[PDB]
Write a protein that binds this ligand. Structure first.
Ligand SMILES: [Mg+2]
Length: 140
């Protein structure tokens, strides 16, 4: 909308951040948290498929079967590239009762190594329809 386009672009951006930071090779787990209006959409209403496909390097410019295969296999093909365990129950959260502060359409991406250590987290907002911004760039 973007409850699909912006979320997908944020996933693409997160992937590029992992490369820019040389944290991709260390990443063994990712977690996505949805807030406000994105969270209120709920499971299987676009935003989840948009993000999971975007974390596999699909760009807005098939999505629902592929979501199904990621959930069935518990493997996310990160960036192309590298298969990691993925468990929806712990790794993809719809936080319908919370808001990030700049805006309703908030999302947080996190990458962990194999020892449970947080490597990086990044907040993006989908700001409509279809642009994204980091938390840090929001006010500019
Ligand atoms: Mg499964």
């Amino acid at each position: 909308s973007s409850h699909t386009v912006g979320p997908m672009l944020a996933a693409n951006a997160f992937l590029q951040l992992l490369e820019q930071k040389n944290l991709f090779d260390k990443t063994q787990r990712v977690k996505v948290e949805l807030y406000g209006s994105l969270a209120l959409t709920g499971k299987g209403h676009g935003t989840d498929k948009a993000i999971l496909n975007g974390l596999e390097n699909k760009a807005p410019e098939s999505m629902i079967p592929r979501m199904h295969e990621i959930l069935d296999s518990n493997l996310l093909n990160l960036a192309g590239k590298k298969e990691i365990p993925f468990h929806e129950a712990t790794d993809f959260l719809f936080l319908q009762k919370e808001l990030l502060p700049k805006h309703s359409n908030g999302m947080r991406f996190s990458a962990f190594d194999g020892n449970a250590n947080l490597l990086i987290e990044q907040v993006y907002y989908s700001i409509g329809g279809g642009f994204i911004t980091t938390e840090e760039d929001f006010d500019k």
